[model samples]
Target: DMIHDAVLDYYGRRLATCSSDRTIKIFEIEGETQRLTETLKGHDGAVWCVSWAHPKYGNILASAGYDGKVLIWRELNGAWQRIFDFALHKASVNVVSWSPHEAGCLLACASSDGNVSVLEFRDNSWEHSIFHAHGLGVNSVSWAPATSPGSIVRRFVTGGSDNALKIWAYDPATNTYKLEREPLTGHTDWVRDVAWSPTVLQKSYIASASDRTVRIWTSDPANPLQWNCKVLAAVWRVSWSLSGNVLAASGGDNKVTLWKENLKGEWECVTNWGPNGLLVTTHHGEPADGTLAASEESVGSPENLARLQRYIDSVSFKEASPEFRELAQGDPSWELASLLFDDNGYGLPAFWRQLVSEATDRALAQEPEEKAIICLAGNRVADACGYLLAAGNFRLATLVSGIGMFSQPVRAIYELLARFGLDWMRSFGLRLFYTTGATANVAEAVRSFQADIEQDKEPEPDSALWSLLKAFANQEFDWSDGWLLTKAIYATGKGQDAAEKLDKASLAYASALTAQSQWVPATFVLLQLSDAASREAAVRDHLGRHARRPRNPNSAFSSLRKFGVPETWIWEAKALDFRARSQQEFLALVWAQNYSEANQAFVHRVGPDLVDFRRLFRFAQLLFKVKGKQDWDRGAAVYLLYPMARLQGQHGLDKFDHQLFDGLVALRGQTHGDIRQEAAIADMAEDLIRCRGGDPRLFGLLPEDVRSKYMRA
Candidate 1:
């Protein structure tokens, strides 16, 4: 059977299978036995997809069908009953996904009619919003995994037949869903599926499958809307295991491949599970147990986690039941147990305790103070473990270089910073900050520390951090040094005479260090501090010397643009008959305005900062005015508005406000304002009318009518 879709229930014991036969079958899988338990009959057309709601919401099941309907089945008193049938779509409802349990009982349904509808069951009422999503059809929708309480950012990803993927976020104030970023475009054909990887930290990864390839989209930690994509292979479906470590993708090539990214940011196919790995069968004959099941055992299971859970169960906590004790412990359980039981709270469930206990029992382990300064600073086990681990990895990184213990400690510290907050990670980040030679560790520590501190409202002072950072102002950190940290340092104005320093450093390490990583940061620092000639020299030298070396395909040219490197220098390099030799180079050229390469990047989505807004806008303008390019309109408008908005504050609103207001007027659009502030609305409306070639004084005489005509208020 060509299974259309399959999903495991909360525990991974029960499976729901839907197929082109227009039937939905429930199967029970215990150990190795798999048996069909129930067959749901409702849809008139083919059943496309099925999603199991969070178990906490009761045994509710949601399925999407080709007949333009979404059916919600509830398990009442041990029998399945169709509680609600949603006939909102005008065409086939391709996919249905339930929000993470943390968001309560919410469901998102996507359709071939180019819309996505989110339905919420609250206060004994069913409320929904059907938002336009794509040009052709929305193929899949995946919600961000559940987060901790009080986190209001509920996000979801959608893929469409428009050959683009878009992320949407819910806003409480607006009581509606809004597009989070520009459409993600890379797929040459329809995007078949999108799955948000479950993460332990604030980091998010989206794996999207399309006919051309499966792309892994990673969010910028500092800016959620900004994403970077790495192409894998042409695949039909992609799923991330709960741990975010393992990714499984299936395609028509008759293979199911498991992929994992290494420390150096290279993704590799680790193993193949099945040639026919489209469906995962589960057994569900027994009553539903309120416990997690061991699904995808190989993907996340190890003896350490299981042993830790056993230890917890043995010691026991208040109100712990025997049934809960026997429930198989997974990584998530291990994480939860640590939060609930470990004294340090930073340690993993019983796993950390067992490991620590065994280490202490050995009697050869160094004192906490000797290993970590955090023990002295906070006098807490959690702080000590985090500091020691990060410190140890930093030491290891300085020795091994390239990739290894460097990224490990960085990742651990990142998770700690997220869990405990910045104040908790202060001493820990400080200790690692001293080890500035290791680029990866230094980059991670500095950026995390800097980004977090900037988010604070009260602006706490850190003399120690400032003193150490200031000492590096005159010191020379080479091209091979931490790029992010170097940027962070420069951003803080803690680095001195950067142009001269970078000029010397780049030349000294030009032959020794890796050019790809070092050159960009070096050029960035120089561009900020150097003159036109000096900046041109840096870019010219780097390009000329490393003519054949590979650069990061996605951001090299964009980086050049962001650093404000002269565009003429880039064209001159082209005049030298220098041509891109790799896919990465091809993308670099595309962003450099070599439109024949690919126009996709021109209209690709960006965060509010619009990384290379000025450059993109210039490129867009030239493409339109010089080349008379009509296809680049979307790219031009996005780049133009972002730069205009950014420059509006520093340079006066008059430069663009007239154009903006007139544009709105030309479109016959109304502006929104606070209804309570009628006087303020009248003044703003009058100003806008005058800018749009209307009478400003006319609004003063008829304020209420003007408010009605111009403002939503």
Candidate 2:
């Protein structure tokens, strides 16, 4: 038998064997027999060892030989060829090993030339390095498995003719290798082979050999410079099980002995098979016959069955949300349901409503004087506040804020309400003022809210519960320091009472409001209350505040009419040309009957101009009808026509002059029986024509059909 060493591929389907005959034979094993498939040949001397690369790089073989070369062979198209030949060693290369796949495409070679070399393939090129590891020669090399947890550094062990085993760590920082610690000792003869454990879960373990005995070496966890070794037997070649828990060594004793660790952390022989005994091959250190038997009976163990049941019950939270939601319709629990609702990414509004209500009930049910209840209620309020804020429902946040005030002190409530807005908390402070009286620090809260509002330091106001407070402010609260908000609410109203309050206490604010309202009597009352200097200062302040503001042309015209300020002044400077243009355009549209241009102007009036555009359209229609009846004496006719006259002086007649005359003449014989009415119509027509330079041809400006219908009469 030429077989020196044999190893199975990852799948155990193909076996590779090498010998001193300088040849590697691959075999296909079926049941109990082996068949030769491919013979790889390239080494000029005996092939000492062979190893298969991990299956990830399919069908690769690394062989080291007496020729001082390590050849990498690959199978292509059912034939094997040497892919790379490493020739750095000067004497026979003793062993070759491929690194674990996690360490990438790396191969380590030990030679009798007293050197060990590592070769790596990267970026379509092979890079190599050689280093003196022993005084006589290096005998064998094995790479530490890279699959180990907690260790990312690539490492390997080398056995040499110097009778020492050296552990090395690859330093990426320097792109070189270094001794891990002091060399491990115990063997007294030339070392032959070394194998690091493949079981990554355990501590780093190495089974090594010498000219006489096989030793197991372990690293000392507490000391970096120390390693502990144990002797097994006289052996030449050593290998470890895939689990790394068991070791098998073969030697000249003609015995293959397996060693395993006992519960006391000592290595002991488990079994041995040799020349005098029947032999059996095992897979992963277990008897092949027993492995199959155990596979059939393994599932029957109670421990295995229990583990399977536990996994089935522990599904993900989202998959079980609907089940928990249905189970807890009325009873609330955070673990089974509330936690499920919170982290689901998008919570429903209904869920928050119930969650908030539950928290409120629990908080209020506790005695107000107890520290336990206060602390619990405070935590729930803070949690609900965060959830409500994230849900974008600030109104509910206000409700929670109000509820939290009973349990938390006013200072704490101020801090919580400050998150929503200062302006918004003003009303709540007022509510507290009514309940707890002036001793409640409620006045300080109102002052802070007003300070923030005036300084623009507060967040945007929440309209929720805000208008309700204003409704209370207008009728409920007395006129005192709270009068500022009262004035704000009044300025938003239409009645005379709204203007009457500002006219009394804050005349400057009253003057601006009445001027904006075009309330003639109120502005006059504010003027009578104030001296001449204050009136001018009020005008200056209002104009300066809005100097940079764009003017509503219609409002500007109305303001100019109500205030009778010949020239608008802002900041004691002439009003901007842009602001003055609005009043000018309104006058032009009225005299020119530019209805489209006038309709497009943005009017800011609270009254007459607030009238809908269609109402004015209908009013114009009624003005034409009044003229057709020759009823100038009708009070309604005078009332409507007079406003049009005041709005544009006599130029307002152009909008209706010709239409009225045409409609009156068209009723000639239709109303001829009413002699006085016909005469009155003629007089009105004559007067209108006289105003237009008394030109009879001006009557020709009427529609031809209406003129013909009247002239024929």
Against the true structure, whose lDDT is highest? Answer: 1
Off by over 4 Å in 2: 30-33, 147-153, 224-233, 271-713
Pairs that collide in candidate 1 are 28-283, 28-284, 29-282, 29-283, 29-284, 553-584
- lDDT for 319 in candidate 2 is 16
Q: What global local distance difference test value does model 1 have?
A: 0.50
Off by over 4 Å in 1: 123-125, 149-153, 222-234, 271-713
Put down candidate 1 lDDT per residue, 1-713, tens digits, no spaces: 65666766554457777776778889885545677788888678888778876533457788888899888887643577777778889899988877875576788898978789999975334677767889788878888854343111188888888988888988877888887576546577888788776533324667777755666766755433322344455567676653224567766554456665443355657511111111111112112211222122232223533453354335333322223224335534323322322222453223433533444333324554244432322323443555554656554333233113246445544443422333432343333433332453433454454555566544335433343332333443422211223333444434455454443333323221222224444344333323444344444534432332223343566555554555544533432222211122323444554344133322321211232545556555644453333344433343354345444433335555555444423322222221222333334345444334333223345664765577655
**CA RMSD for every model?**
27.2, 42.2
* TM-score per model over all chains: 0.40, 0.39
lDDT (C-alpha, whole model) for all candidates:
0.50, 0.47
- Model 2, 1-713: lDDT tens digits are 44555656543456676766677888874435667798877678888777877543446888887888888887743567667788988898877877875577788888888788898865334688666678788877878765321101188988878777788789877778888675646577887777776533224667776646666766545332322344445567777653214566656664456665543355657522111010112332212111110011111324322331232223221211113332323333312233322322334223444444445454445443232223223324454454444543454446364554453334444444533222332333323322332344423444454455566653335442333323332233332221233333444431243332244344533432332322332232233332444445433333323332324364553443244432334212222212222333333223323223222221211012321434444444434443432243232232233233234324444655444444445543344333334444444444444244222323233443465467569
